Amino acid sequence: TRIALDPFVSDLEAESAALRAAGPLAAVELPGGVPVWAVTHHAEAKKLLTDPRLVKDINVWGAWQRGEIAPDWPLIGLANPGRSMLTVDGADHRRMRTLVAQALTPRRVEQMRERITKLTEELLDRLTGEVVDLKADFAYPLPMYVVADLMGIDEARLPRLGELFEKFFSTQTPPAEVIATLTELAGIMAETVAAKRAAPGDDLTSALILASEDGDHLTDAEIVSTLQLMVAAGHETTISLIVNAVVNLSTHPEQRALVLSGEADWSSVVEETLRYSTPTSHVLIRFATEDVPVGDKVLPAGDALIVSYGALGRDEAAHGPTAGEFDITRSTENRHISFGHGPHVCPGAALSRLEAGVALPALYARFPKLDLAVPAAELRNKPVVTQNDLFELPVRLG
Ligand code: HEM
């Protein structure tokens, strides 16, 4: 029995519970009428994520081979981006990933702690009034500035990039605007790369350009695709991580009391938010080169697989009978896999942990009484099916 993912994300908790119930391999419908499989249990996700029969090569997708995927499908930017580390495996994946991954180790991202701290304090300084949209005024700008600095993007481009990524991630973007959004994104990223080719810097775009002389030899198009990937994957997720941590503390007063009183550390808030309420509900997209058994089902060769990180985060087989609860003090035998698992594991994990690990204590140090300004049930997800993304975060600064 297929689960059609709600394009309007009207009850994400209920949909996640249905996906777990239908697992480990659930039949699902992506917005736009595209049928795929979703892995929704922790153990089977880890196996599929390291299974060499589950590849990123879209030429393996039967629906792609048959020409049944429209180029103006709103999800096309997520399902079929340009060639980058995201869309390859094997030796090509190593070549396309190594520079970025090594630039983002925990040791390397510490270099940015000062910039992240200064950005955080500057944003907190500008909060005005008793009630604010903390997403628009804080959680959204911080990771956009951070990834823009990382990648050498001109800060003057960030307002437009924000407008474009809103369309990129929405299920409701009309066909002409799907296409126009991807073309304009390509232009902004190409302009950034062209600028760094002329004057190479410490930013990661410059580093990729230099390595394409000096070893890795990514093509011009692959560098632009990698830049777009880094901005897409690095701002949207980190914003939701900060938003969801504030929501979770505001809906669990004992957990808020623990961390604000020093009985638990902020890292535990971040890690439990990642497990309980990941920024990334689903990851597109993998394809079976051969029939693959999953539980009592067979994933047929040529079919597609998404990984339902949101659903599997609350898998009771992984975390026990309290897996559906937000508990920053929990003991579990299984660490969460909200950054993925295997070769494609998020290279930005340390940077996101640093951003959230700086932003959250700074926020509550400035505003110890900070609370949602509305009952949490009134918060509304944007029509973004792969990301847990809220329209706004009304907050009383207290
Ligand atoms: C903030 C929380 C974040 C979460 C929850 C997250 C989640 C993930 C996950 C689950 C994957 C692997 C998907 C899969 O293979 O199934 C991934 C890949 C990736 N992420 Fe993150 N991410 C976050 C932040 C970031 C940041 C800050 C950056 C960049 C600075 C980034 C860049 C990437 C890239 C480039 C990939 C592709 C890696 C590959 O396929 O080799 N992410 N992310």
Residue-wise DSSP of 57-119: -GGG-HHHHTT-S-TT-TTHHHHSPPSSGGG--HHHHHHHHHHHHHHTSHHHHGGGHHHHHHH
Residues in the chain: 398
| 356 close to 239: Cβ distance less than 8 angstroms | no
Q: Can you name the residues that pair with 131 across neighbouring β-strands? A: 396
The token pair at 386 is 């792969």
3-state secondary structure of 322: coil
- Asked if 312 and 48 touch (Cβ cutoff 8 Å), the reply is no
Using CB distances shorter than 6 Å, the residues near ligand 1 are 85-86, 97, 147, 229-230, 233-234, 237-238, 241, 278-280, 283, 307, 309, 338-340, 344, 346-348, 351-352
Write the single-letter amino acid at 189: M
- What does the alpha-carbon distance between residue 31 and residue 7 come to, in Å, rounded to a whole number? 6
**Token code pair at residue 347:** 């290279």
For the chain, percent helix, then strand, then coil, each to nearest 5? Answer: 55, 10, 35
Spatial separation of the C-alpha atoms in residues 328 and 134, rounded to whole Å:
22
Cα 81 to averaged position of ligand 1 atoms, centre (Å): 15
Structure tokens at 94: 């190593």
Q: 280 and 237 in contact (C-beta within 8 Å)?
A: yes
Tell me the DSSP string of 9-24.
-S-HHHHHHHHHHT-S
- The number of angstroms, rounded, from the C-alpha of 36 to the middle of its chain's C-alpha atoms is 20
Under a CB-based contact definition with an 8 Å cutoff, are residues 258 and 361 in contact? no
Task: Please tell me the experimental approach by which this structure was elucidated.
Answer: X-ray
Residues 70, 75: Cα–Cα separation, whole Å? 10
Q: Is 286 annotated as a binding residue?
A: yes
Directed axis angle between helix 158-169 and helix 175-198, to 10°?
Answer: 140
Alpha helices, DSSP H, located in 86-218: 90-103, 106-109, 113-125, 134, 141-151, 158-169, 175-198, 204-214
Tell me the C-alpha to C-alpha distance, in Å, between residue 27 and each of 85, 220, 248.
27, 38, 30
Rounded-to-integer distance, Cα 313 and Cα 326, Å? 11
- Which atom of ligand 1 has the smallest separation from the CA of 150? 30
Please tell me whether residue 256 adopts helix, strand or coil conformation. helix
184 to each of 61, 153, 164, 167, 325, how far by Cα in Å?
27, 15, 8, 11, 42
Q: Which amino acid is at 87?
A: T
Q: Which residues contact 136 (CB under 8 A, 6 or more apart)?
A: 392
Q: Looking at ligand 1, which residue's alpha carbon is closest to its atom 23? A: 237
* C-beta separation of 235 from 144 below 8 A: yes
Between the CA of 187 and the centroid of ligand 1 the distance, in Å, is 23
Q: Which helix (H) or strand (E) holds 27?
A: strand 25-30
Nearest residue to 280 (alpha-carbon basis) of 249, 318, 251, 239:
239
Neighbour-count burial of 334, counting CB atoms closer than 10 A to its CB (0-12 exposed, 13-18 middle, 19+ buried)? middle
Sequence spans of domains, the chain: 1-398
Q: What is the residue whose two structure tokens read 């020093």?
A: 262
Of 197, 269, 272, 266, nearest to 227 by C-alpha is 197
Residue nearest to atom 17 of ligand 1 (CA): 346
- Of 193, 187, 183, the C-alpha closest to 223 is 193
Give distance in angstroms: CA of 101 to centre of ligand 1.
11
The dihedral through the CA atoms of 374, 378, 383, 387 has a sign that is positive
Residues 6+ apart with CB under 8 A from 49: 307, 337, 340, 341, 342, 344
H or E segment to which residue 30 belongs: strand 25-30
Distance CA 190, CA 187 (A): 5
The C-alpha atoms of residue 388 and residue 385 are separated, in whole angstroms, by: 8
